[PDB]
């Protein structure tokens, strides 16, 4: 099953403040109107160059994610788990079960912060570049039942973790979600007077978008 990410998965590409300007950036983005896999639940998926993840399920249903390679005790793995009061992020040679793991030896990284998670849609972007695991997120109300919403909303930086490991595969920890993949695309991003991205053009979507990017206009 597939759904249409009409204009979803756009995030602030850097930490530079901009306002009242159209900025052209080359980065890993979810291509506009791409096919996003619609999962019900819970398989192990490839990470590729980065992952777009979205769900409308409650915080007590989707607990977190595991990122790594062999996802066993042979290598370092990244475990992100939320609970009622906090979020715990660890990198260890975990031996996962089937409450998530039986052992966590050779730990190299630990981080603790506030929780990451008519309905409410939660969107995340996971990137792993030069040893840094970058997470972007957005939380927005939604009135849809069988698909992704239309409209534009940019995702903000949530955390940037100096974990220093390679990620090739990942799995969602459950107690109904969408998965897409990022590609190297050129986007024209529109910043309003408050420095908020309110729109975007995918310069490689169609002839009209190409024209808009060329002329730097919407």
């Amino acid at each position, epitope marked *: 099953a597939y759904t249409n990410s009409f204009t979803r998965g756009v995030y602030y590409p850097d930490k530079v403040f901009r306002s009242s300007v159209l900025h052209s950036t080359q980065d890993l983005f979810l291509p506009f109107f791409s*096919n996003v*896999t619609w999962f019900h639940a819970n*398989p*192990v*998926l*490839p*990470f*590729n*160059d980065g992952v777009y993840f979205a769900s409308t399920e409650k915080s007590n249903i989707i607990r977190g994610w595991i990122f790594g*390679t*062999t996802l*066993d005790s*042979k290598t370092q793995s990244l475990l992100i788990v939320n609970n009622a009061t906090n979020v715990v992020i660890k990198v260890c040679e975990f031996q996962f079960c089937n409450r998530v793991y039986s052992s966590a030896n050779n730990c190299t990284f630990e981080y603790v912060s506030q929780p990451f998670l008519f309905k409410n849609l939660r969107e995340f972007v996971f990137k792993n570049i030069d040893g840094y695991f970058k997470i972007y997120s957005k939380h927005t109300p939604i009135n849809l039942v069988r698909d992704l919403p239309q409209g534009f909303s940019a995702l903000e930086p949530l955390v940037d973790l100096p974990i220093g490991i390679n990620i*090739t*595969r990942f799995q969602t920890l459950l107690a109904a979600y969408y*998965v897409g*993949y990022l*590609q*190297p695309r050129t986007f024209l991003l529109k910043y309003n007077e408050n420095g908020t991205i309110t729109d975007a053009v995918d310069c490689a979507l169609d002839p009209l978008s190409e024209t808009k990017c060329t002329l730097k206009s919407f």
Partner: antibody
Amino acid sequence: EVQLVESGGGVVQPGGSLRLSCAASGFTFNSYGMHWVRQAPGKGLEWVAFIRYDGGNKYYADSVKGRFTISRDNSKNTLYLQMKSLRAEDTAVYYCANLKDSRYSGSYYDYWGQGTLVTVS
Amino acid sequence: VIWMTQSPSSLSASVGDRVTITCQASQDIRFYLNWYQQKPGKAPKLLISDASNMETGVPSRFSGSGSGTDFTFTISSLQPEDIATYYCQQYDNLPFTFGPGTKVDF
């Protein structure tokens, strides 16, 4: 049900060319990298080529490098192999596959097609 | 390119016998080795990944272990349905390679 169906095999002359295709269904084709593997009559398995999920990066075995080209169309869920300057040594059954690989493709599942015979004579 | 070798190229065994197949890499491939089982006219089936991780649906009589250059595949008690050619494959680096193949018969 996951399926991989090879087609486009047949008999060609030495120095000629043949294009194979593999129709994929039952799985998220555009999320996985894909491989071609061939097996000559009475011989073991030999890896031929690999393409990433976006079709961007391509890798070949030294024995076919410069003669074979790998490509994919993610809108048709179809993998292709274009073989030029075919030699007698290229006679083999060609398979498309998603090989389990924790380092490069990130595939957690192993899928194979039934294979198609290419004869050079 | 990593050269893969297997030994024995062929072995005979009865039902209930213990069967061991050796696979050796010319380079240290850590634990990035797959084991396949192929029967005549069929595509190869994966039995073991990451040197020693068993695939789902694979009988408990199958096992494997090893690290670096020397790996072993074992059938603790050969069954009539285990008559096949076994291959080892490395995916530590590209190009990927398969071993010669070991034929098991009665």
